[PDB]
Design a protein around this ligand. Structure first.
Ligand code: CL
Ligand code: MG
Ligand code: MG
Lengths: 241, 226, 244, 250, 196, 224, 243, 231
C-alpha cells in the first residue's frame, strides 16, 4: 500500500496524498470569506490568538503579494509562507519580463500549475493549503481566484474557505439569488467590508470583537490590510443599525 | 532603409521603404520591412535583415504563447521588454534596430529600439540610413492632435524623403495603420512612384540560340509500382 | 528515503531471468498478431488491428505497419506509444548513416541499433523496458530481402517466416507447414492471410481489421518499392485469395 | 534534496498489465463526458461545464482550449493535468514546428507530440501518468478535417466520431446510429447536442455546455487586414446565445 | 548628459537635460533621464543608454521584491543594489548613476555611483559630460537647507550653463521633486532657461 | 583585467619605540579631476590595527566590506573575541595578502597598494605592505605611490635601520610623518591638503585623528 | 499505516508524523527561554552538568548571528548549530546586497523557509530543535520561536524544552503583572529565576545558568553575554526566590 | 525497529537509531583517556592487537604542531575526520597566519558529523575522538561523539570499560589540574587513570600509547621503549 504514501494512482484512479493535503487545510480551524463590490474586492478571515505569550500583531494568514494582489491562506503557516514567498517572487519576475503587473487570475494559474506538478512528481509533496487571490484587475475588474492542493483553480463571484465553508457558501448563495447580480452593489469599500462581516456573523452564528477578525481590501492600484481600530469602526457601524 | 512611426488621434501608424541592399547592389526591389509581432502590434526593422526578421518572430512567437497563457490580448510594453532584454544579452551582436508600434487594452503606443538594448518613446520616430531625411520632414510638419488621414500623409512623405534622398532607400512605400477599437490595416505598396519605363528593345531570343551538349528527363517522382 | 518505492526493474530472478522482460513479453502476447513472410522476389507484412469500431477512421489510421525508410518497414506488436518512440529513433539512425556514408543503411545494422537500445533498459537506468516486439522487413544490396524480429530483451534473430503478438505458437506451426524456399510474393500474400484467418480470435477476417504491406522488386527495373495497402486494396486481395 | 526518484513508478505486473496506466484510465472513466463529431465541412467538440459551486464563475474555467488557430482540444478526467498539457501542447507547436517551418503543425503531428509527452510520463523516473484522455479536432491544407483521441498510455487513434468519460459507452452507440459521411457541420452540431443531453443530469443550456467547432476561416477574428493569404482561424468557440438558438431547433 | 541631484530642507530634487546622442546626431531631443526605481527613490542616468536602462530595470525588480517581503527600502539600500550591479560588472558596463530618495526617518539623501562602481553619499551630486563645466558654479552656489524654490533655481541655473557649453546636452530641463507631500514633475523649456 | 577609475594617492607609515604611525589624504581623484574631497582611506580594524589603502576606490570599498565581515566572522562562537582570540594585525594582513595574490592569479586584480599597521599581542610593532600583484615586504618605514619616492627618504633619516626604532619617540615620529605629508602636497598633483593620521601604541592604544591640514607652508619666495 | 516511516507523507489525518516525532526530541532537551523587554530581548538556557569534569563556563550554547541577533535552542544541539550556520549565511547575503543588517522579521522567515524545506522531501530529516531567537532592528525589539514544522510567530515571552510548561506559566505572570513593560535589567533577573524554577523537571543533576541580551540602552542594540557581577547578581536573585 | 533502516528517520519517541548504533561502535573500541592541567594536556591510549603475531593498532593521530587526537571505534572514520582537521588547521595557518583554536576545531567537527545524520544515502561516523591541544587560551581537552556533540572537559575517557577511568578522574580532579610544569607527573596520573579500566591484561611496552602537548612542547607521540619509564 505505497500508493497512499506518494502521488501515484490508486486502483480507483485516486490520489490519496492530494486528498490528505485537503484535510491538512483545515488544521488551523480558521474560516475565510471573499466578496466583490463595484470598485473593490474584500477578504475577511477569523483571527485566533490562543496563547497570551504571543505577539498578536505577528499572527496573520493574509499576505500582500504585490501592490495590487492580496492572498489569504487556509492551512498551516509554514506551507502558507512557502506559497507566499513563491507568489511574491513570481509576481515580481512577471513584471520584470513582460513590463506590466501580473494579473490576479494569471498568478492563480501559475501557482495552480506548480501545485499540479507536486501531484504528478513523486519527490515533491503537495502543500496543505488553499490560496485565495484577490485584486481589482485593470482589465477584468474586481477578481477572486482560488487555488487548492489538486492544482485546480477558478474565478468566483464570492467564495468561502475553512471548516464551516458550507454554511458561509449557502448564506452567500441565498443573497445572490435575491439580488440577481454578480457583486455587492455598493460604492465604498467600507460598506462592502461591513457586508462581509455581517454575513459571516449570520452564517457562523458568532459575534466578533476587533481582535477576532482580519481584513484585507483590494482597490484600483493597491491592496491593503485593516488595523484593529479600522475594524472596530466597521463593527460599530454594524451594531448601530 | 527608411522607417518611420507617427502617433495620431486614436492610434499609431508605421511606414517603410521597400529596398534591400547588399553593399551598392539592390538585392530585392520590393522588400517587406513591416513585420507582424501580433495582430495589432507591428514593427519595422533596419540593420541586419535576418536579425530583425528573426528577433521579431521569436518575440512574436513568445508573445502569442503569453497571450494564450494569460487569456489577454498582447501588450506593446511586453514586446518592448522582451525585445530589449534579448538584444541587451547579446551586447549588440544581433544587429536589429526596430520601431515598435501597436494598440492594446491600455491604449496606443510607439517605441524604438537599438541593437544594444536601449529603448525610446515618442510621438514621431525614424530609423535606418534614411532616418535623417525622414526626421527632417517629421520635424517640419508634425503637430499635436493629428488625424488618421494626416498621419498617413506625414508618414509616407517622410519615407518619400528617404526614397529620393538616401541611396540606401528606394522603390515603394509600405504602411500599416493601428487604430484603437479596429483591425490593424496593412497597406502593402501604398505608394508606387518608381515603376520602370518600357525598354527600347525586346531581348527574347530565337529558339535554338543556345548550344546544348546533352538532354535528359529528371525523375522527380518516387519509385513506381509494378 | 526513496529506495522504499523502487521496483528494481533491472534485476535477475533466482532462475536467471529478467522479471520485467518476461512480464513485457506477457503483455505482447495479448497484442494483435503480426506476420512476416520472405520470398525470393519480395517480402510480405500482414497484421491484425485490435477489436475495432465502425466509427474508427481506418484510411487515416496506423497502429501496426510503419515506414522506417524507403527500403525498410516494421510491423508492431505491443504498446503503440512505446513503439513510436523507438520508430522515430530508428528513422533518425537511418538518416545519420545515410549522411555519414552516402549509402542506405544495411538492414541488420538498423536492427542491431534498436535492439541495443532495448538491451540498455534491461541492464541500467532503473526504468521499465519497452513493451514492444518488432518484425523488420527490408532490402539491401548485400543480403537482399531480410526478415528480423526483436523483443524487449534486445535480442534479435533472422527469419524466412515469423509471427509476433497473439497466438504465435499456432501461427508459427501453420507457417512451418506451408512455407517453401522457392515461394513467390503472390503465394506468400495468400499464406499470410490464410494464417491470420485461422489464428484470429475474431469471428471473421475482414478488410477493416487488417493492415497489409509488401516490399517488392516489382518496381520498374533494379529498384525496390514499398506498398502500404489501402482499405479498398485489402478488400480486393481478400476477395482474390478467396477469404471473403 | 535532489529528485532521488530516478526509477520508473510504472512497471509491468506478472500478467503483463501496466498498473498505473490502467488506474489512470479509471480516473478518466470517472470524468465528465466529452465528445467529438466530424462532418464533411467541419468538426465539433463538446462537453459539460460541471460547475463545482454556483458561486464559481464557470466561464473562467475553459474545458475546450485553442491549441493553434486551426486546432482545438477537449478532455475527460483530471482538469489540472489537462491544463498543463494544453500549456505544453501550445509551446511544442511552436518550438518543434512553427519556429522551424514558419507554419502551424498539421493535426496528426501535434497529436503525435502530445502523445509523446504522455508516453514519457509512463516510463520516465519519479512520475505518474497523466490522468486524462484528450479529444483533439483540427484542420490543415493537405489532410483536411480530422479528429483524434489520445489516452494516458500515449496511444492515439483517428475517429469519425467518438466519446470519452462517464457515459461514453452509451454515447458511442448513439453516435453510431446517427453518423454518416454526408453530414454538414450544422447536422453534426445538432447530433452533438442530442448526444450530450443524455449524459447531463441538471441544467442543459448555453451556460452549462461548452462547445467549439473547427470549420470555415474566420477573417473577422484575425485582428488585421491586408494579407490575402491570411484568412483567419478555423477554430471557433460557440457563444452561450449561439448554443441556445440551436436548442430551440432540438 | 547633464544630470544632478540636490538635497534641501524638505527633501531632494533630481534634474536632467533631455538629449540623447549618437555622435553629432541628436537621436532623441525629448528624452526622460529621470527614472523611477521606487515610489520615492529615483535615479539620474549617464553613459550607455542600453546599460543604464538594463541596470535600472533590474534595480526596480529588486526593490519591488524587497518591498513585498520587508516593506519600503531605504535610499541607502537602493544605492547598494545599484553599486552591486555596477561594481561586479565593471568590465562590461559604462554607467554613471546618481541615486536620490526621500525617507521620513532619513529625509532627502543623494548617492553618486561613478564608472568604477564606488559609492559616495553627498549633499548634492553632478554627473554626465556637461557636469565638468559647472563644478565651479555649483561649488560656489550650493547651500545646505535651501527652500524648494531656491533649489529649483539652483538646478535650473546650473543645468542651463551645462547645456550652454556641452554640445551633448540640451533640449528641456526636467526635474522631479521628492518630499513628504509626494512626487512632483517639473519641465522647463529653452525660451525660459536660455535667457537666465 | 581593468583600469582604475576613482583613485587614492600615497599612504605613508613608520615604526617608533612603542608602536606605529600611518597617514593618508582624503581625496578621491577622477583622472586629473579632484572629484571627491571627503574620502577616508585609513580603515581601523578593532583597537590594534589600521589598514591604509591607495589605488582604486571601488576596490577599496570592497576591501573595507571584507574587513568588516572578517570582524563579524571572528566573533562567531568565540567567547574570547575581545581578548586572547581577537584579530591580530598579522592575521588581517595575511588574509588580505592571500586575497590580493589570488585575484592577480585569476587575471582580475584588486587595483590597490595596501599597508597594514598595528601592534601585536606581545607588544611587537607590525608594519607590512601588499599590492595588486600580491607582492609583500616589511621595513621600518613604508609608503605607496609618490610616498615611496618622497616620503621614505625623509622617514629613513629618522629610522634608518632596526636599531633606530627604540631611539625614536612618538613626538619625533609624528613630526616626521606630518612634514612628509606637507612635502607630498607641494609635489604630488593628485594630493590634497586634508588628511587623516592614526597612531597605534602598545600603551595608549589606537588614536585616530581626522580633519588634519597641511600647515606652515612656504610660498613667499614666489614673488621673485 | 506506514505513514510515519517517511518524511513529507501526509497521513489520512493530514499530518506529517515525522515532524511530530522531531518535536519529541525537542521536548527531551534542556529548557531554554526568551523574554521581550522595553527596548530589547533576553535569552537564557539551562546547561546540565553531567559530570564534575565539565569545564565551567566553557561549553557555550547561545549563539550570535550577525552582531544584533541571538539564538538559543532545545533538542539536538548539532541540528541547532546547522540552523545557525545557515542563518549566518542568510544574514551575510542580505547585508551584502542591501547594506543594512537583516531585520528580525526578515531573518525569521529565512530560518522558517529553510526549516519548512526539510518537510517537503523524504530524502531529508526534519530539524530536531525548537529555536528561540531575536534582537533589535530599526523598528525595535523582536522575539521569535521556530518549531520543527517551520512554524514561527512573534512572542512577548517564549519557552521550550523539558521544563517548558513551568516556564510558560512564569512568563504569563510577567505579561499580566507588567502591561507597561519590563526593563532589560529586570528581564535578566527574571530570566535567571525562570530557568531556576524550570530546573525542577531536571532536578536529578545540577546545572549551569547562561544568559545573553540585546538592548538599545544597555548594549547599543548588539548581542552580548551576561558575565561576571551582573551574572552573579542574577544568580543571587534567582536563588533567593526559590528559597 | 521499523525506524532504524536509515539516518533520515526519527522514531516515535524522537530517537535516531542509526546514530545510536554508530555510538555503539565506540563502546566496542579499546579504552583511551584524556586529561589536562593548566600547562599541559595528555592522551593515554590502550592499543589493541589482533593476535600475538599482529601489531597493536595505533590510536593517536597528530593534526598539527599544537593539536592532535586519540580514537575509539572505526579507525578509517578517524582517518577521514583527522584528515579534515589537518586541512582546517592548515587553512588557518596559510590564510590567516593563525593557529586554529581547539574550541573552533570542535565546532568544525560537530558540523561535519551533523550533515551525515540528516541526509539520505549517507551514514553517521562510527568513531569517538579525544582532542587535546595548546592554543592562545592555554591547554584544552575535547570529547567528540559522532552524533555531533562536542564537549570541553578537564578529563575524560571513551571506549570499553571507560567508566572506571572516568570515575578516577572525577575523584582526582582537584589534584591533576594543579600539576603545572611537570609533564611526567601528569602522564603518571593518566597512566593511573587508564589502569582503572584494565581487566586480565596489563600495560606492556607495545600495549601503551601516550601523547602530550603543552606550553613549550609540540604534540609528540610516545610508543615502544619510550613508555617503559611509565610502566
Ligand atoms: Cl506555469
Ligand atoms: Mg508528489
Ligand atoms: Mg547644447
Amino acid at each position: 500500500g505505497y500508493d497512499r504514501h506518494i502521488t501515484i494512482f490508486s486502483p480507483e484512479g485516486r490520489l490519496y496524498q492530494v486528498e490528505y493535503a485537503f484535510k491538512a487545510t483545515n488544521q488551523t480551524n480558521i474560516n475565510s470569506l471573499a466578496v466583490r463590490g463595484k470598485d473593490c474586492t474584500v477578504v475577511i478571515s477569523q483571527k485566533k490568538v490562543p496563547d497570551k505569550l504571543l505577539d498578536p500583531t505577528t499572527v496573520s494568514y493574509i499576505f500582500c503579494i504585490s501592490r495590487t494582489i492580496g492572498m489569504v491562506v487556509n492551512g498551516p503557516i509554514p506551507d502558507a509562507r512557502n506559497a507566499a514567498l513563491r507568489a511574491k517572487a513570481e509576481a515580481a519576475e512577471f513584471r520584470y519580463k513582460y513590463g506590466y503587473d501580473m494579473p490576479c487570475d494569471v498568478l492563480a494559474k501559475r501557482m495552480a500549475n506548480l501545485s499540479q506538478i507536486y501531484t504528478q512528481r513523486a519527490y515533491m509533496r503537495p502543500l496543505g493549503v488553499i490560496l485565495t487571490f484577490v485584486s481589482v484587475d485593470e482589465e477584468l475588474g474586481p477578481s477572486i481566484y482560488k487555488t487548492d492542493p489538486a492544482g485546480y483553480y477558478v474565478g468566483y463571484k464570492a467564495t468561502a474557505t475553512g471548516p464551516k465553508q458550507q454554511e458561509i457558501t449557502t448564506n452567500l448563495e441565498n443573497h445572490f439569488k435575491k439580488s440577481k447580480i454578480d457583486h455587492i452593489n455598493e460604492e465604498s469599500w467600507e460598506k462592502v467590508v461591513e457586508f462581509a462581516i455581517t454575513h459571516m456573523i449570520d452564517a457562523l452564528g458568532t459575534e466578533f470583537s476587533k481582535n477576532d477578525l482580519e481584513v484585507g481590501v483590494a482597490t484600483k492600484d493597491k491592496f491593503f490590510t485593516l488595523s484593529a481600530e479600522n475594524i472596530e469602526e466597521r463593527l460599530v457601524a454594524i451594531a448601530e443599525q | 532603409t527608411t522607417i518611420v512611426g507617427v502617433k495620431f488621434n486614436n492610434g499609431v501608424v508605421i511606414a517603410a521603404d521597400t529596398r534591400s541592399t547588399q553593399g551598392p547592389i539592390v538585392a530585392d526591389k520590393n522588400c517587406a520591412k513591416l513585420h507582424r509581432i501580433s495582430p495589432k502590434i507591428w514593427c519595422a526593422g533596419a540593420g541586419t535583415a535576418a536579425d530583425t526578421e528573426a528577433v521579431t518572430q521569436l518575440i512574436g512567437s513568445n508573445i502569442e504563447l503569453h497571450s494564450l497563457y494569460t487569456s489577454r490580448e498582447p501588450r506593446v510594453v511586453s514586446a518592448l521588454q522582451m525585445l530589449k532584454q534579448h538584444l541587451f544579452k547579446y551586447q549588440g551582436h544581433i544587429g536589429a534596430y526596430l520601431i515598435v508600434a501597436g494598440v492594446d487594452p491600455t491604449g496606443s503606443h510607439l517605441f524604438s529600439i537599438h541593437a544594444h538594448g536601449s529603448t525610446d518613446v515618442g510621438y514621431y520616430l525614424s530609423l535606418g540610413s534614411g532616418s535623417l531625411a525622414a526626421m527632417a520632414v517629421l520635424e517640419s510638419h508634425w503637430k499635436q492632435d493629428l488625424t488618421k488621414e494626416e498621419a498617413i500623409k506625414l508618414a509616407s512623405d517622410a519615407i518619400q524623403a528617404g526614397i529620393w534622398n538616401d541611396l540606401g532607400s528606394g522603390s515603394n512605400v509600405d504602411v500599416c495603420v493601428m487604430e484603437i477599437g479596429k483591425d490593424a490595416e496593412y497597406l502593402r505598396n501604398y505608394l508606387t512612384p518608381n515603376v520602370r519605363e518600357e525598354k527600347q528593345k525586346s531581348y527574347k531570343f530565337p529558339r535554338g540560340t543556345t548550344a546544348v551538349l546533352k538532354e535528359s528527363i529528371v525523375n522527380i517522382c518516387d519509385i513506381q509500382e509494378e | 528515503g526513496s529506495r522504499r518505492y523502487d521496483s528494481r526493474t533491472t534485476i535477475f530472478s533466482p532462475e536467471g531471468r529478467l522479471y520485467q522482460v518476461e512480464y513485457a513479453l506477457e503483455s505482447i502476447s495479448h497484442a494483435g498478431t503480426a506476420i512476416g513472410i520472405m520470398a525470393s522476389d519480395g517480402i510480405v507484412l500482414a497484421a491484425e488491428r485490435k477489436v475495432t469500431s465502425t466509427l474508427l477512421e481506418q484510411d487515416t489510421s496506423t497502429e501496426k505497419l510503419y515506414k522506417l525508410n524507403d527500403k525498410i518497414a516494421v510491423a508492431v506488436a505491443g504498446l503503440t506509444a512505446d513503439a513510436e518512440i523507438l520508430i522515430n529513433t530508428a528513422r533518425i539512425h537511418a538518416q545519420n548513416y545515410l549522411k555519414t556514408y552516402n549509402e542506405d543503411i544495411p538492414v541488420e545494422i538498423l536492427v542491431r541499433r534498436l535492439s541495443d537500445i532495448k538491451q540498455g533498459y534491461t541492464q541500467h537506468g532503473g526504468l521499465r523496458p519497452f513493451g514492444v516486439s518488432f518484425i523488420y522487413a527490408g532490402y539491401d544490396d548485400r543480403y537482399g530481402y531480410q526478415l528480423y524480429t526483436s523483443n524487449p530483451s534486445g535480442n534479435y534473430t533472422g527469419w524466412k517466416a515469423i509471427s509476433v503478438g497473439a497466438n504465435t505458437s499456432a501461427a508459427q506451426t501453420l507457417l512451418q507447414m506451408d512455407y517453401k524456399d522457392d515461394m513467390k510474393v503472390d503465394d506468400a500474400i495468400e499464406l499470410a492471410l490464410k494464417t491470420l484467418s485461422k489464428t484470429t480470435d475474431s469471428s471473421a477476417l475482414t478488410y477493416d481489421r487488417l493492415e497489409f504491406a509488401t516490399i517488392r522488386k516489382g518496381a520498374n527495373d533494379g529498384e525496390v518499392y514499398q506498398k502500404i495497402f489501402k482499405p479498398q486494396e485489402i478488400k480486393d486481395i481478400l476477395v482474390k485469395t478467396g477469404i471473403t | 534534496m535532489t529528485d532521488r526518484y530516478s526509477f520508473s513508478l510504472t512497471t509491468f505486473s506478472p500478467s503483463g498489465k501496466l498498473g498505473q496506466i490502467d488506474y489512470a484510465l479509471t480516473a478518466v472513466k470517472q470524468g465528465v463526458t466529452s465528445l467529438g463529431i466530424k462532418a464533411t465541412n467541419g468538426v465539433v467538440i463538446a462537453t459539460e461545464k460541471k460547475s463545482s459551486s454556483p458561486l464559481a464563475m464557470s466561464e473562467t474555467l475553459s474545458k475546450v482550449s485553442l491549441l493553434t488557430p486551426d486546432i482545438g482540444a477537449v478532455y475527460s478526467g483530471m482538469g489540472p493535468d489537462y491544463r498543463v498539457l494544453v500549456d505544453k501542447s501550445r509551446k511544442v507547436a511552436h518550438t518543434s514546428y512553427k519556429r522551424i517551418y514558419g507554419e502551424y503543425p498539421p493535426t496528426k503531428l501535434l497529436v503525435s507530440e502530445v502523445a509523446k509527452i504522455m508516453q514519457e510520463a509512463t516510463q520516465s523516473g519519479g512520475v505518474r501518468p497523466f490522468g486524462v484522455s484528450l479529444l483533439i479536432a483540427g484542420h490543415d491544407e493537405f489532410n483536411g478535417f480530422s479528429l483524434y483521441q489520445v489516452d494516458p498510455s500515449g496511444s492515439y487513434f483517428p475517429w469519425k466520431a467518438t466519446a470519452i468519460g462517464k457515459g461514453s459507452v452509451a454515447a458511442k452507440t448513439f453516435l453510431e446510429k446517427r453518423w454518416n459521411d454526408e453530414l454538414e457541420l450544422e447536422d453534426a452540431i445538432h447530433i452533438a447536442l442530442l448526444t450530450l443531453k443524455e449524459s447531463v443530469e441538471g441544467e442543459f443550456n448555453g451556460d452549462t455546455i461548452e462547445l467549439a467547432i473547427i470549420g470555415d476561416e474566420n477573417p473577422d477574428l484575425l485582428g488585421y487586414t491586408g494579407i490575402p493569404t491570411d484568412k483567419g482561424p478555423r477554430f471557433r468557440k460557440l457563444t452561450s446565445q449561439e448554443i441556445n438558438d440551436r436548442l430551440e431547433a432540438l | 548628459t547633464s544630470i544632478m541631484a540636490v538635497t534641501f530642507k524638505d527633501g531632494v530634487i533630481l534634474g536632467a537635460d533631455s538629449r540623447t546622442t549618437t555622435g553629432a546626431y541628436i537621436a532623441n531631443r525629448v528624452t526622460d533621464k529621470l527614472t523611477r526605481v521606487h515610489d520615492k527613490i529615483w535615479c539620474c542616468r549617464s553613459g550607455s543608454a542600453a546599460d543604464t536602462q538594463a541596470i535600472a530595470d533590474i534595480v526596480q525588480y529588486h526593490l519591488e521584491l524587497y518591498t513585498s517581503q520587508y516593506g519600503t527600502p531605504s535610499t541607502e539600500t537602493a544605492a547598494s543594489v545599484f553599486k552591486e550591479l555596477c561594481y561586479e560588472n565593471k568590465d562590461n558596463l559604462t554607467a554613471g548613476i546618481i541615486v536620490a530618495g526621500y525617507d521620513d526617518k532619513n529625509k532627502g539623501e543623494v548617492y553618486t555611483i561613478p564608472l568604477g562602481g564606488s559609492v559616495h553619499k553627498l549633499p548634492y551630486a553632478i554627473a554626465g559630460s556637461g557636469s565638468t563645466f559647472i563644478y565651479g558654479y555649483c561649488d560656489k552656489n550650493f547651500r545646505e537647507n535651501m527652500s524648494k524654490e531656491e533649489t529649483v533655481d539652483f538646478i535650473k541655473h546650473s543645468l542651463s550653463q551645462a547645456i550652454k557649453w556641452d554640445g551633448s546636452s540640451g533640449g528641456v530641463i526636467r526635474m522631479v521633486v521628492l518630499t513628504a507631500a509626494g512626487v512632483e514633475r517639473l519641465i522647463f523649456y529653452p525660451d525660459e532657461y536660455e535667457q537666465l | 583585467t581593468q583600469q582604475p577609475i576613482v583613485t587614492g594617492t600615497s599612504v605613508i607609515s613608520m615604526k617608533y619605540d612603542n608602536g606605529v604611525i600611518i597617514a593618508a589624504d582624503n581625496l578621491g581623484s577622477y583622472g586629473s579631476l579632484l572629484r571627491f574631497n571627503g574620502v577616508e582611506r585609513l580603515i581601523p580594524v578593532g583597537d590594534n590595527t589600521v589598514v591604509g589603502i591607495s589605488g582604486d576606490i571601488s576596490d577599496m570599498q570592497h576591501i573595507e566590506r571584507l574587513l568588516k565581515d572578517l570582524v563579524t566572522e571572528n566573533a562567531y562562537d568565540n567567547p574570547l573575541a575581545d581578548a586572547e582570540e581577537a584579530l591580530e594585525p598579522s592575521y588581517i594582513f595575511e588574509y588580505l595578502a592571500t586575497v590580493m595574490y589570488q585575484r592577480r592569479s585569476k587575471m582580475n586584480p584588486l587595483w590597490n597598494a595596501i599597508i597594514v599597521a598595528g601592534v601585536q599581542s606581545n607588544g611587537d610593532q607590525f608594519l607590512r605592505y601588499v599590492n595588486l600583484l600580491g607582492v609583500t615586504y616589511s621595513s621600518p618605514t613604508l609608503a605607496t605611490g609618490f610616498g615611496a619616492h618622497m616620503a621614505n627618504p625623509l622617514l629613513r633619516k629618522v629610522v634608518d635601520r632596526e636599531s633606530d626604532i627604540p631611539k625614536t619617540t612618538v613626538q619625533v615620529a609624528e613630526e616626521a610623518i606630518v612634514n612628509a605629508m606637507r612635502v607630498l602636497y607641494y609635489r604630488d598633483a593628485r594630493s590634497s591638503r586634508n588628511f587623516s593620521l592614526a597612531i597605534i601604541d602598545k600603551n595608549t592604544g589606537l588614536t585616530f585623528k581626522k580633519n588634519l591640514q597641511v600647515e606652515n607652508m612656504k610660498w613667499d619666495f614666489a614673488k621673485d | 499505516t506506514g505513514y510515519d516511516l517517511s518524511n513529507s507523507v501526509f497521513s489520512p489525518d493530514g499530518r506529517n508524523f515525522q515532524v511530530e516525532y522531531a518535536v519529541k526530541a525537542v521536548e527531551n532537551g534542556t529548557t531554554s527561554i526568551g523574554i521581550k523587554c522595553n527596548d530589547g530581548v533576553v535569552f537564557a538556557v539551562e546547561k546540565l552538568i553531567t559530570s564534575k569534569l565539565l569545564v565551567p563556563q566553557k561549553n557555550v550554547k547561545i549563539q550570535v548571528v550577525d552582531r544584533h541577533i541571538g539564538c538559543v535552542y532545545s533538542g539536538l544541539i548539532p541540528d541547532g548549530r546547522h540552523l545557525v550556520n545557515r542563518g549566518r549565511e542568510e544574514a551575510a547575503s542580505f547585508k551584502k546586497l542591501y547594506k543594512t543588517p537583516i531585520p528580525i522579521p526578515a531573518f525569521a522567515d529565512r530560518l522558517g523557509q529553510y526549516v519548512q524545506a526539510h518537510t517537503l522531501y523524504n530524502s531529508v530529516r526534519p530539524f530536531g530543535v525548537s529555536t528561540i531567537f531575536g534582537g533589535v532592528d530599526k523598528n525595535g525589539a523582536h522575539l521569535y520561536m521556530l518549531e520543527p514544522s517551520g512554524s514561527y510567530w512573534g512572542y512577548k515571552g517564549a519557552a521550550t524544552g523539558k521544563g517548558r510548561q513551568s516556564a510558560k506559566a512564569e512568563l504569563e505572570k510577567l505579561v499580566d503583572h507588567h502591561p507597561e513593560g519590563l526593563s532589560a535589567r529586570e528581564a535578566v533577573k527574571q530570566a535567571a529565576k525562570i530557568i531556576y524554577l524550570a530546573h525542577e523537571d531536571n532536578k536529578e543533576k545540577d546545572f549551569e545558568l547562561e544568559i545573553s541580551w540585546c538592548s538599545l540602552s544597555e548594549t547599543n542594540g548588539l548581542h552580548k553575554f551576561v558575565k561576571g557581577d551582573l551574572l552573579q547578581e542574577a544568580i543571587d536573585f534567582a536563588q533567593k526566590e526559590i528559597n | 525497529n521499523n525506524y532504524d533502516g536509515d539516518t533520515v528517520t526519527f522514531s516515535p519517541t524522537g530517537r535516531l537509531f542509526q546514530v545510536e548504533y554508530a555510538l555503539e561502535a565506540i563502546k566496542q573500541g579499546s579504552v583511551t583517556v584524556g586529561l589536562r592541567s593548566n600547562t599541559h594536556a595528555v592522551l593515554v591510549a590502550l592499543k589493541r592487537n589482533a593476535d600475538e603475531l599482529s601489531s597493536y593498532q595505533k590510536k593517536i593521530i597528530k593534526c598539527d604542531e599544537h593539536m592532535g587526537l586519540s580514537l575509539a571505534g572505526l579507525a578509517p572514520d578517524a582517518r577521514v575526520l583527522s584528515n579534515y582537521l589537518r586541512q582546517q588547521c592548515n587553512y588557518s595557518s596559510l590564510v590567516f597566519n593563525r593557529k586554529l583554536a581547539v574550541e573552533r576545531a570542535g565546532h568544525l567537527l560537530c558540523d561535519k558529523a551533523q550533515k551525515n545524520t540528516q541526509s539520505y544515502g549517507g551514514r553517521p561516523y562510527g568513531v569517538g575522538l579525544l582532542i587535546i591541544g595548546y592554543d592562545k587560551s592555554g591547554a584544552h581537552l575535547l570529547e567528540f561523539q559522532p552524533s555531533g556533540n562536542v564537549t570541553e572537559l578537564y578529563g575524560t575517557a571513551i571506549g570499553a570499560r571507560s567508566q572506571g577511568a572516568k570515575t578516577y578522574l572525577e575523584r582526582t580532579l582537584d589534584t591533576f589540574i594543579k600539576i603545572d610544569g611537570n609533564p611526567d607527573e601528569l602522564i603518571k596520573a593518566g597512566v593511573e587513570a587508564i589502569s582503572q579500566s584494565l581487566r586480565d591484561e596489563s600495560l606492556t611496552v607495545d600495549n601503551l600509547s601516550i601523547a602530550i602537548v603543552g606550553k613549550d612542547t609540540p604534540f609528540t607521540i610516545y610508543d615502544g621503549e619510550a613508555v617503559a619509564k611509565y610502566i
